[PDB]
Scaffold this active site. Structure first.
Site, PDB file in Angstrom:
ATOM      1  CG  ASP A   1      68.880   6.413  13.759  1.00 14.11           C
ATOM      2  OD1 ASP A   1      68.909   5.334  13.131  1.00 14.11           O
ATOM      3  OD2 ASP A   1      69.053   7.524  13.216  1.00 14.11           O
ATOM      4  N   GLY A   2      71.650   5.860  14.654  1.00 12.18           N
ATOM      5  CA  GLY A   2      72.916   6.451  14.293  1.00 12.18           C
ATOM      6  C   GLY A   2      72.834   7.076  12.914  1.00 12.18           C
TER       7      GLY A   2
ATOM      8  CD  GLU B   1      72.014   2.984  13.535  1.00 12.58           C
ATOM      9  OE1 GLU B   1      71.300   2.815  14.549  1.00 12.58           O
ATOM     10  OE2 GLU B   1      71.659   3.694  12.570  1.00 12.58           O
TER      11      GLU B   1
ATOM     12  CG  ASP C   1      66.314   2.931  12.015  1.00  5.51           C
ATOM     13  OD1 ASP C   1      67.233   2.998  12.860  1.00  5.51           O
ATOM     14  OD2 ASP C   1      66.198   3.748  11.078  1.00  5.51           O
TER      15      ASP C   1
ATOM     16  CG  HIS D   1      63.473   7.521  10.721  1.00  9.03           C
ATOM     17  ND1 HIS D   1      64.342   7.081   9.746  1.00  9.03           N
ATOM     18  CD2 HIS D   1      63.066   8.753  10.335  1.00  9.03           C
ATOM     19  CE1 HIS D   1      64.450   8.004   8.808  1.00  9.03           C
ATOM     20  NE2 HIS D   1      63.687   9.029   9.141  1.00  9.03           N
TER      21      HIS D   1
ATOM     22  CG  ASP E   1      65.894   8.963  13.218  1.00 10.30           C
ATOM     23  OD1 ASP E   1      66.298   7.911  13.746  1.00 10.30           O
ATOM     24  OD2 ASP E   1      64.708   9.152  12.890  1.00 10.30           O
TER      25      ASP E   1
HETATM   26 ZN   LIG Z   1      66.860   5.840  11.438  1.00 14.77          ZN
END
Ligand SMILES: [Zn+2]
Ligand SMILES: [Zn+2]
Lengths: 155, 155
Positions: free
Chosen positions: A10-11, A48, A70, A124, A134
């Site tokens: 995730d970013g 991401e 995601d 998430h 995250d």
């Molecule tokens: Zn996320």
């Protein structure tokens, strides 16, 4: 069969552009490896990409990889843009360089090593490994230590 | 004194890029007027700019405008970069054209016409007109009839 591996990415970014960070977890048979870093001026899209890049590049052998993310941006690139970029010399249809090409190529370079099964999660919520990435990304965006040298400033 | 007017703006995009629309509401002492339109391939940020542009360009005289939006992108531009862009000639520090310059310049032209007091709302809950603009914008994104001619395709 190849060594099967689970990757979660995730970013997070505080602006566009703004301070940002990425989070990534690499798990193989229970043992976990965490990746995270925060940058002073970047984009969510680039964080991401970096999360998937750094996790894939950690793999020291050909693997069967389940990559959970995601990111709508990564999904839209993998499933819809990458093929056209390959047959176009990494340019747009108007013959101009594609955005974040530095990271898309680096990501595509890591993809060729492995057999990748992408699982596009909704959000998430629910999945613990995706919530943990995250947390690393958001914590990193709140404590940036590096410069995103590859981000071409557009503002 | 200037005529006071309320303006609410929002944007929506089904991809990045993808189909999108803007929604705006102009209110003068109870009376209400709406603006909205959908585009085939655009971005959410460009729709947020279009929403304020079309509503501001509809005023026929100098006004006091209470411009309410929940757009992070518009808020970032106004509260951070709009002064630097004018001082630099709408270029980056690196002497490159800023992203979405066509719409930022058009918005700046409209903003210079009135006395603007921004109201940055944080969500859709509890904001009826802002919620309507999201509805207007989403409806337009579901029925795109125009082409975003100013959008420079990045993929
Ligand atoms: Zn996320
Ligand atoms: Zn909204």
């Amino acid at each position: 069969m190849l060594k099967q591996v689970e990757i979660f990415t995730d970013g997070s970014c505080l602006g566009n552009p703004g301070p940002g960070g990425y989070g990534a977890i690499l798990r193989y048979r229970g043992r976990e490896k965490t990746f995270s870093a925060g940058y002073t001026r970047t984009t969510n899209n680039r964080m991401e990409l970096m999360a998937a890049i750094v996790a894939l590049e950690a793999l020291k052998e050909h693997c069967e990889v389940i990559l959970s993310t995601d990111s709508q941006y990564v999904r839209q690139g993998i499933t819809q843009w990458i093929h056209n970029w390959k047959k176009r010399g990494w340019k747009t249809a108007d013959k101009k360089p594609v955005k974040n090409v530095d990271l898309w190529q680096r990501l595509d370079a890591a993809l060729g090593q492995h057999q990748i099964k992408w699982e596009w999660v909704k959000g998430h919520a629910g999945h613990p490994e995706n919530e943990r990435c995250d947390e690393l990304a958001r914590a990193a965006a709140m404590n940036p230590t590096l410069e995103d040298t590859g981000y071409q400033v557009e503002v």
